[PDB]
Ligand binder design. Structure first.
Ligand code: PCA
Ligand code: NA
Length: 396
């Protein structure tokens, strides 16, 4: 009977704090399912109290607030490795932070599982100890363009021009770059490609430029505070894009709609998760009920669903390893091949390629309609019709 300790790094203060708090609540939800005995058909690890592979040993976590700062994330990772002696790492939301921190654990030879950082570059580093469960922005951008192509075929090929606007750290830069490359390859004309700092107090120059150019599709990659600033500024300058397809995250912050209210109407984002999938995936309801007891009564959303899924992958790998030895955990992650049966996201399973990326991911697009995100794509998996054009400020 052997316990295991995992380090968990997220932003728990600052502009994206609710993201981090709800992610940690999701991990705590997983720990509740793992460490206690639960009757949940279809969910590995539920029935046993603790991991059968560790003789009933319990998982514990040590949690660090990195504040969105890569250098802090690096320092916290070092302390978790060297002082806390964690046997695996989990985190860390921001691609910038995940990249920097996972380089430390890589060199230490300690497995790092990521639930929700989407820079494509994180899995092209030649690493051996890094495993990512979320789709990355290559996959999510592919989905955006499949949607634009299908809309085009149905609507006279009227979506011709794109405006890309992105925050300037790893995630936003790679997101915007992925979109730009794919645009060029698919014949779409990029008429703005704007980089900005997430901590900026003004986006008025950027919004003026986008309004003047008036792209057919607006493609923002923003964190929470900057997403709010962007939308507030757009309203203030009466900038009315007809289609806004966001790379999540600010647009999937747990409190995005609560904060923005009618300002969010018509916005589209990519996601692997929506509660309107629960008739197709009833496990969502089961886990949601448990999550509420950890989240202060708030429902699952994108980031907690992804973090929960990621942490379950790690837990299952440890169980399968029958060991807390970091090398055996790594090998169990290499060997992992989970079906979709236990999942709360519409992935086909969890199975990593040689680059550490989950091969079985899948995403959706969802649109704010009447105060809730609703699945709109693919057109076969949709809870409602796309609203196009987006309402103008005066109509929201
Ligand atoms: O899907 C997401 C959430 C955070 C952001 C990133 O990788 O920084 N992408
Ligand atoms: Na259990």
């Amino acid at each position: 009977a052997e316990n295991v300790k995992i380090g968990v790094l997220y932003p728990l203060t600052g502009p994206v704090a609710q993201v981090g708090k709800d992610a940690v609540a999701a991990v705590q939800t997983a720990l509740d399912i793992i460490n206690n005995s639960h009757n949940i058909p279809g969910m590995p690890l539920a029935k046993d109290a603790g991991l059968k592979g560790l003789g009933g040993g319990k998982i514990s976590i040590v949690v660090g607030d990195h504040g969105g700062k890569p250098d802090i994330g690096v320092g916290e990772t070092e302390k978790m490795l060297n002082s806390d002696k964690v046997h695996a790492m989990f985190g860390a939301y921001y691609s910038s932070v995940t990249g920097a921190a996972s380089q430390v654990s890589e060199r230490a030879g300690i497995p790092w599982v990521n639930g929700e950082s989407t820079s494509p570059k994180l899995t092209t580093r030649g690493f051996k100890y890094f495993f990512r469960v979320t789709p990355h922005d290559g996959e999510f951008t592919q989905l955006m363009f499949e949607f634009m192509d299908d809309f085009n075929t149905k609507n006279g090929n009227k979506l011709k021009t794109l405006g890309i606007i992105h925050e300037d750290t790893l995630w936003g830069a790679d997101s915007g770059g992925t979109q730009n490359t794919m645009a060029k390859d698919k014949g779409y004309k990029v008429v703005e490609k704007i980089s900005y700092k997430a901590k900026t107090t003004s986006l008025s120059s950027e919004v003026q430029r986008l309004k003047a150019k008036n792209p057919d599709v607006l493609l923002p990659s923003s964190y929470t505070a900057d997403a709010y600033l962007f939308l507030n500024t757009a309203k203030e300058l009466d900038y009315n894009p007809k289609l806004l397809v966001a790379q999540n995250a600010g647009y999937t912050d747990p409190k995005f709609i609560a904060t923005m209210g009618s300002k969010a109407e018509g916005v589209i984002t990519r996601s692997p998760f929506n509660t309107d999938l629960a008739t197709t995936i009833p496990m969502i309801g089961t886990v949601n009920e448990i999550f509420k007891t950890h989240s202060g009564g708030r429902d699952l959303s994108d980031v907690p669903a992804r973090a929960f899924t990621g942490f379950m992958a790690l837990a299952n790998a440890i169980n399968n390893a029958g060991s807390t030895d970091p090398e055996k955990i790594r090998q169990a992650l290499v060997d992992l091949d989970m079906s979709s049966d236990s999942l709360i996201v519409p992935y086909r399973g969890i199975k990593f390629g040689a680059d550490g990326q989950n091969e079985k991911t899948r995403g959706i697009l969802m649109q704010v309609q009447d105060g809730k995100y609703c699945t709109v794509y693919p057109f076969e998996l949709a809870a409602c019709k796309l609203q196009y054009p987006m309402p103008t400020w005066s109509q929201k």
